[PDB]
Amino acid sequence: MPLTQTQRLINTYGASLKNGTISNEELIILLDPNTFTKSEGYVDPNAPVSDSNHSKMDAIKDFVLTIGPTLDSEILHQLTSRMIELSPPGDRNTFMRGSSLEKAFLAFEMAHYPTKAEEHFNSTRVRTEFPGENDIDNLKAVILNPIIAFFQS
Numbered sequence: 001m002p003l004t005q006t007q008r009l010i011n012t013y014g015a016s017l018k019n020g021t022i023s024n025e026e027l028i029i030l031l032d033p034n035t036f037t038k039s040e041g042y043v044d045p046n047a048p049v050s051d052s053n054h055s056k057m058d059a060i061k062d063f064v065l066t067i068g069p070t071l072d073s074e075i076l077h078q079l080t081s082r083m084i085e086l087s088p089p090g091d092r093n094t095f096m097r098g099s100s101l102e103k104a105f106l107a108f109e110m111a112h113y114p115t116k117a118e119e120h121f122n123s124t125r126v127r128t129e130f131p132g133e134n135d136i137d138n139l140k141a142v143i144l145n146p147i148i149a150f151f152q153s
Contacts, residue, residue: 004051005036006062017067020075028086031101036060057099061150064104068151073113080105080117084125095129096143107144111151 002010013030016022022030023139029035038056049058068076083102087095096103120126121136130136 002066003049003054003059003062005054005059006066009035009063010066012068014067017079018070018075020078022079024082027082028088031083031087033088033090033098033100034061036099036101055099057104057147060099060101060104061147062102065151066106068105068108068112069093073116076105076109076113077116077119080109081123084120084123087125092111093129096124096139103144104147107147108151110144111148 001007013026036056036059039052039054040111042053043058044053047053049062054062071079075113080102083105087100087102089143090098106117106120107118121130121139125137126139130139
């Protein structure tokens, strides 16, 4: 079973994600950096991911792991593109570094549909935030890679 946090957020948001009808306003709210949280206290790496033991990324991963398999590939692509366009402006040089839903959706698409997901690196937002070849290289090999690897196994 998924985390309780995941279940509640799927209960609220799942239907409007699955058919891609979620409005820009509700998608913006879903993308609020505080929508997903680590468990209170510390994460014990020697214990399984649970309701009382999970990082912020653990929680986001669990949510995507749950909703992702319900998505048509083109619906997933469209959702990921919208999330990249609508993701909140943070401090300089912070886009995709923090644990975020847009990073996880992109990673999930790269894990399962890599040819289609490649188009996201051409987007205005990714180009703005990662303007150089090497910026994109690290985005893929360092920032996205562990999350992609999680979804693949």
